[PDB]
Design a protein around this ligand. Structure first.
Ligand SMILES: [Zn+2]
Lengths: 96, 559, 109, 286, 278, 93
């Protein structure tokens, strides 16, 4: 061929050299894509605390004291200044 | 240059197919269509000068050169050549490929035995019945999953879900099943739900051009006049499905029901029935009554005025159409008139790559939220079938910098319309958009892989859609169900292992009452999407014809 | 054929070349959007606040705090400082309605 | 009396939405209404108002009418819901004032001791912070004219309020705030020369026009007086900075020094810590 | 019979008296009235909102004076547009703006007067600038419990408004009520000047006006030096050594980027010498 | 004059005002109480320094003298202000 299949490889070498060069620039982008998605997930984390705060926004959230446990899954709640309460399930952590 | 190219194609020996596949390669790699067809027009001449005749070359220049005088002379010689066998290939090739505008031009010069044979090929008469008999054979009906979604007993969203789901697997069989089995359950439907009963009746009955008239006479709006006015409004839109592309005698059937009884909700199904029937025909009288429907000022009828106008004027690029549409967009008080007009001016401009860019500058730049959605559906159809880098520039800018979430959605949805030639590029470019915190972008991000990769069997799109149905937002899960149902069409478990995994998930979430009614609507619908046409028929925008598929895109973009 | 692919291969080369400004322009915007999100969390709750007494750190991202009225409140901690100013027993400011854990005393007033 | 006024975007819109009211029916003149002021101190503030049908004939250039049945009973309406809100004056959209505007204020002085008129603008154009405000006094004149009633300009400034930024500042959504410290101050500098030196050229051409025509205004004397206060430094050729020359760079002394000192250690924080965390993940993975 | 989901077009002028009259009643709850036009079943517009007398004894259905409206509508005739009344609204600043026990008693009375009578609530507290807040609702008839109880068609305009679902007691009122969609028909003419009037008044008043030297940098150097050692002990704290201490911990922020912008403030403000002068 | 050329030599005051060196004190310091000039006097070289200024009336040559030295501040600053806009618009964007 002589134009050619010896020269075209050098032509294909330029592209493959740039392809590896691009892959180097892509490898610089790929790990940098993580720094985005990370902070993009962290941008959802500040919105996760915002969304979670809306659940805790109205009255806040309290701390109770359980004097006795029932098999019906209703658990008695007691606050120190307040009176005793009770609530239906309410199942999060293992009951044991 | 085209000089030395003539010497390269004329080189001795063979080169048996080197001119054949090069046109397939050049069409993909050519950025500027200017001198592309100039290379093709001189190629199809040396095919005829060559001793061995080849009819796959004239198939390519027919659609690209779109010369009505050239396509008339090639078959005029075949009439004198008197052999119907060799011309039988280009007979149906001109049918399935060429659009409605080119079919109307070629049918006139040709008909001016072989004259009776060309009537049913371009009108699709015999083409419907041969595939009408294909359906009833290969169709395998499964009523199990249909009943598993029937017993949920949800008062709303159920009437729309099951009647659109059975129409999937029942395509073209014309049989009546869910109408006869339960009369009372269909009577429980009301408002726009009974609009679907006469509508989905035209789905199962799609094709079968003969009996479509007298079979639906029970739903006639003029004579019956049912108590609910929305039941009689779907009879006009029902036959428009069957009459998509090619028309028929029903043109008078729509004319009789537009002037009587129901108003204006007749114009809703009437214009969509007449507009889809005149789609691609560049008809006039339909454009006349569509302008006064544009000025009716009613919001619901505004969709029917815009959607039917882009249909009839598709490929014609009417100047006064958009001028009356976009000229009415500023002072109108409703969003729905802006929506049908958004796709209306989008549907008329297709595949230009240049002329449509004059309107694109006005659409996206304007501050109207719906008109910015209009620019995306307009730039999609204009750039459909190309990887141009000028469209992706403003495509991301409106998908990010714009404050409205609904326009960001429709923005990333335009990637599936333009890139369907090379579907491999969509999972890469839409990847980073899948982590967007707002689910409105993820709804369109999932659709971009759904509409573009529907024909492909790519497993990576299935992998990217796996976390989409795991997201806490309800409708992004639904958008993941339809999109993952498009990738599996006609593909069984032996193709990809995720088939049976998704099939059990569709019936699961809909039988679970704790799940949202929203997402579970697309569950049984994802089944039907996989079961569409009894698994017999697929939806492919990329075919040997090369043309886009208008009814599937228009239907899924409205959906 | 080798020049064919030689004219094919620079596409994704240049297609990823425009993908360089794709992310780089996108990530800096979102970076400024993330810096704008820093003003968000610092905006909440602004004023007013109510004093409360910290009891113990039960786990990550949340802790229990006794109110000045005496009722112990279980509140999600702020994502900024989870550790050094927590302390076993300290007086921490809370929001009126939400009683949000934000900042403790120096100590102390 | 009235020194400066505070115009909220809410009450200014009450003039703008009435421009849609009588704008569709036309025809002549403008939008005019009576202003409800909130006066807690010498600084004037405006919260709400009520627009009244009003017309001013051309021919007949001196003809004007407020509807005072609209003014009386509707006052008892806003007074019943808001006890603090009362009428401090009137307003209109201008853009300029015809001579007839002298009689609108003097009629309603029975309602308020001094009625402040607010000229507003429905279409924002130029040159800056919009609308306008006038106060009604009598300065007579030096030439000996009979007592001259001429409205003196009152500086107008926009102000905010709690709970009113909910829907107002929401709809824009396209603004970048701000960013203070980088672009915020420098864009002003490019404009401070523009808006600073354009009024410089507009006035210096009208001040040259004085000798030509339009004399009076003589002015007098306010024109050159504060211009000579501008003349503490001219600054002309060349800058007369011989005393401020060494002081010029001496103000840049520490600003460049710290910028040299901070970027050195900020690098030590950026460069070191980046190299550490990078090679810890990079090479230990493969 | 046929019921379609309604779309509420609010005018920028009607948005004013919602928060403004609501601010005048703060903390206590007010009672207003909505003014607009009924175009059709699936869309509705409120073209005006006016203030009604606040009740210091608590909100009641008699708080609205019928001669107050009769004298108002007559004053609206001489005003540019005399449009018919539509519905009512009330502020609820003290809580999350939900329909109270009085709000349901004034529902059947107002829905008898006018067809829809959309219930609209608003609160100042939930945010300041960048949130719509407010509220809206429409009574679904409890007599319909015999019929289908799940309107409306064209769902997710409700369904999406059904997000976030706003805790419990709010959506606990979704029994006998359904909310309504609020979108803004474009006022952008006014909305364009709303941005121009706001930002120009916030840009140095002329843009000119605004445009502790070394000492502010001597106070800054304490933040640019004395803060460095407490910042640069942490990399020596990152050295364990090695390694018994729990890792990773990133102390790089926020002081580094603050001192960056701290120079950005001081450099361009010192450019005022080169910018303003010559 | 455009000055500054702010501080003035006593011989110039001894020329225009034609006052003796010993009486220049009472002269310029009395103007300090009148309010036409606040400038303190430098008594080492006996040069009288000026601050602020007192404008009086105007003349036809004062407007022409204004446009010379007033607009000169407008054309000089805006010329180099474009240099601030030109080069620094790239780092803003
Ligand atoms: Zn109430």
């Amino acid at each position: 061929l002589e134009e050619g299949k010896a020269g075209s490889g050098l032509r294909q070498y330029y592209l493959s050299k740039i392809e590896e060069l691009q892959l180097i620039v892509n490898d610089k982008s790929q790990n940098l894509r993580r720094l985005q998605a990370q902070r993009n997930e962290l941008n959802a984390k500040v919105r996760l605390l915002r969304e979670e705060l809306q659940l805790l926004q109205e009255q806040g959230s309290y701390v109770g004291e359980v004097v006795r446990a029932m098999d019906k899954k209703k658990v008695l709640v007691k606050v120190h200044p307040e009176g005793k309460f009770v609530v239906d399930v309410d199942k999060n952590i293992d009951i044991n | 240059r085209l000089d030395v190219f003539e010497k390269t194609i004329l080189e001795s020996n063979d080169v048996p197919g080197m001119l054949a596949y090069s046109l397939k390669l050049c069409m993909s790699l050519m950025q500027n269509k200017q001198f592309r067809n100039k290379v093709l027009r001189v190629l199809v001449k040396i095919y005829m000068n060559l001793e061995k005749p080849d009819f796959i070359n004239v198939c390519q220049c027919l659609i690209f050169l779109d010369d009505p005088q050239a396509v008339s002379d090639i078959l005029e010689k075949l009439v004198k050549e008197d052999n119907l066998l060799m011309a039988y290939q280009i007979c149906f090739d001109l049918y399935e490929s060429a659009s409605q505008q080119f079919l109307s031009s070629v049918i006139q010069n040709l008909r001016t035995d072989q004259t009776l044979k060309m009537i049913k090929i371009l009108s699709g008469e015999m083409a419907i019945e041969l595939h009408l008999q294909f359906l009833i054979r290969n169709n395998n009906t499964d009523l199990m999953i249909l009943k598993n979604t029937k017993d949920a007993v949800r008062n709303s969203v159920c009437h729309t879900a099951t009647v659109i789901a059975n129409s999937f697997m029942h395509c073209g069989t014309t049989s009546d099943q869910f109408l006869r089995d339960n009369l009372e359950w269909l009577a429980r439907a009301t408002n726009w739900a009974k609009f679907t009963a006469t509508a989905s009746l035209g789905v199962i009955h799609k094709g079968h051009e003969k009996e479509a008239l007298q079979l639906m006479a029970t739903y006639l709006p003029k004579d019956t006049s049912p108590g609910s006015a929305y039941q009689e409004g779907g009879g006009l839109y029902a036959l428009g499905l069957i009459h998509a592309n090619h028309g028929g005698d029903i043109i008078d059937y729509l004319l009789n029901q537009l002037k009587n009884a129901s108003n204006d909700i007749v114009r809703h199904g009437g214009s969509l029935g007449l507009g889809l029937a005149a789609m691609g025909t560049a008809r006039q009288d339909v454009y006349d009554l569509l302008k006064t429907n544009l000025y009716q000022d009613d919001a619901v009828t505004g969709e029917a005025a815009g959607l039917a106008l882009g249909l009839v004027m598709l490929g014609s690029k009417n100047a006064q159409a958009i001028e009356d549409m976009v000229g009415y967009a500023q002072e109108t008080q409703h969003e729905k008139i802006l929506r049908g007009l958004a796709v209306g001016i989008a549907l008329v401009m297709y595949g230009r790559m240049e002329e449509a860019d004059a309107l694109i500058e006005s659409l996206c730049r304007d501050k109207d939220p719906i008109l910015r959605r209009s620019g995306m559906y307009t730039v999609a159809m204009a750039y459909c079938g190309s990887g141009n880098n000028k469209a992706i520039r403003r495509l991301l800018h409106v998908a990010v910098s714009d404050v409205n979430d609904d326009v960001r959605r429709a923005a990333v949805e335009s990637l599936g319309f333009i890139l369907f030639r090379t579907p491999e590029q969509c999972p890469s470019v839409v990847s980073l958009l899948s982590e967007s915190y707002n689910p409105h972008v993820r709804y369109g991000a999932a659709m971009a892989l759904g509409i573009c990769c529907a024909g492909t069997g790519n497993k990576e799109a299935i992998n990217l859609l796996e976390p989409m149905t795991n997201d806490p937002v309800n409708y992004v899960r639904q958008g993941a169900l339809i999109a993952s149902a498009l990738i599996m069409i006609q593909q069984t478990e032996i193709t990809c292992p995720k088939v049976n995994q998704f099939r059990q998930l569709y019936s699961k979430v809909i039988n679970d009452k704790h799940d949202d009614v929203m997402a579970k609507f697309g569950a049984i619908l994802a089944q039907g999407i996989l079961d569409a046409g009894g698994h017999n028929v697929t939806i492919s925008l990329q075919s040997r014809t090369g043309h886009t598929h208008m009814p599937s895109v228009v239907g899924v973009l409205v959906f | 054929d080798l020049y064919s692919r030689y004219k094919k291969l620079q596409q994704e080369l240049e297609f990823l070349e425009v993908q360089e400004e794709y992310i780089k322009d996108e990530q800096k915007n979102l970076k400024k959007e993330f810096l704008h999100a820093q003003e968000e969390v610092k905006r909440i709750q602004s004023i007013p606040l109510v004093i409360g007494q910290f009891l113990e750190a039960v786990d990550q991202n949340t802790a229990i705090v006794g109110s000045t009225t005496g009722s112990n409140y279980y509140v999600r901690i702020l994502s900024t400082i989870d550790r050094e100013l927590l302390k076993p027993n300290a007086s921490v400011a809370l929001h009126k309605h939400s009683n949000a854990l934000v900042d403790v005393l120096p100590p102390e007033a | 009396a009235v020194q400066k006024v505070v115009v909220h975007p809410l009450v200014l819109l009450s003039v703008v939405d009435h421009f849609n009211r009588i704008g569709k029916v036309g025809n002549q003149k403008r939008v005019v209404g009576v202003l409800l002021g909130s006066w807690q101190k010498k600084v004037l503030d405006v919260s709400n108002s009520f627009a009244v049908p009003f017309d001013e004939d051309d021919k007949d250039d001196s003809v004007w009418f407020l509807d005072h049945d609209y003014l009386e009973n509707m006052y008892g309406m806003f007074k019943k819901v808001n006890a603090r809100e009362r009428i401090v004056g009137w307003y209109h959209t201008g853009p300029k004032l015809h001579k007839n505007d002298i009689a609108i204020n003097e009629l309603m002085k029975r309602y308020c001791p001094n009625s402040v008129l607010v000229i507003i603008d429905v279409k924002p154009k130029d040159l800056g912070l919009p609308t306008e405000a006038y106060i009604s006094v009598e300065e007579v004149h030096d030439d000996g004219t009979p007592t001259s009633k001429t409205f003196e300009h009152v500086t107008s400034e926009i102000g905010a309020e709690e709970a009113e930024e909910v829907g107002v500042e929401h709809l824009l959504r396209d603004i970048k705030d701000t960013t203070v410290g980088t672009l915020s101050q420098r864009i002003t500098n490019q404009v401070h020369g523009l808006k600073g030196l354009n009024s410089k050229l507009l006035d210096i051409r009208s001040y040259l026009e004085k000798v030509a025509t339009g004399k009076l205004p003589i002015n007098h004397q306010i024109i050159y007086q504060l211009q000579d206060v501008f003349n503490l430094l001219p600054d002309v050729s060349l800058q007369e900075f011989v005393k401020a020359f060494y002081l010029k760079t001496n103000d840049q002394m520490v600003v460049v020094y710290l910028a040299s000192l901070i970027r050195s250690v900020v690098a030590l924080h950026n460069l070191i810590n980046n190299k550490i965390a990078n090679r810890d993940a990079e090479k230990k993975e493969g | 019979a046929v019921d379609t989901a309604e779309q509420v077009y609010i005018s920028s002028l009607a948005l004013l008296k919602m928060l403004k009259h609501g601010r005048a009643g703060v903390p206590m709850e007010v009672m207003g009235l909505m003014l607009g036009e009924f175009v059709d079943d699936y869309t509705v517009r409120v073209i005006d909102v006016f203030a009604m007398p606040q009740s210091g004894t608590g909100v009641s259905v008699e708080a609205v004076d019928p001669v107050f409206q009769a004298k108002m509508l007559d004053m609206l005739k001489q005003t540019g547009r005399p449009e018919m009344v539509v519905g009512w609204y009330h502020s609820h600043p003290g809580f999350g703006c939900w329909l109270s026990g009085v709000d349901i008693n004034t529902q059947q009375s107002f829905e008898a007067l006018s067809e829809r009578a959309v219930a609209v609530v608003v609160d100042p507290i939930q945010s300041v600038k960048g949130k719509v807040v407010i509220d809206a609702f429409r009574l679904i008839n409890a007599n319909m419990m015999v019929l289908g109880h799940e309107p409306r068609q064209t769902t997710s305009n409700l369904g999406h408004l059904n997000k976030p679902s706003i805790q419990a007691l709010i959506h606990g009122l979704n029994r006998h009520y359904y909310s309504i969609t609020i979108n803004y028909r474009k006022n952008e003419l006014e909305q364009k000047m709303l941005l121009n009037l706001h930002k120009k008044s916030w840009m140095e008043g002329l843009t000119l006006q605004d445009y502790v030297v070394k000492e502010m940098l001597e106070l800054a150097k304490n933040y640019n030096k004395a803060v460095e050692e407490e910042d640069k002990m942490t990399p020596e704290q990152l050295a364990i050594k090695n390694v018994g201490k729990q890792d990773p911990k990133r102390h790089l922020e926020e002081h580094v980027d603050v001192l960056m912008t701290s120079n950005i403030v001081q450099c361009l403000a010192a450019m005022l010498d080169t910018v303003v002068f010559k | 004059r455009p000055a500054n050329h702010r501080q003035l030599t006593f011989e110039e005051i001894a020329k225009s005002a034609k006052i003796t060196v010993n009486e220049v004190e009472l002269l310029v310091m009395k103007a300090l109480s009148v309010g036409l000039v606040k400038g303190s006097i430098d008594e080492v070289d006996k040069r009288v320094h000026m601050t602020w200024v007192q404008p009086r009336v105007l003349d036809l040559q004062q407007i022409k003298g204004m446009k010379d030295r007033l607009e000169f501040w407008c054309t000089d600053v805006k010329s180099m202000e474009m240099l601030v806009e030109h080069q620094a618009h790239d780092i803003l964007t």
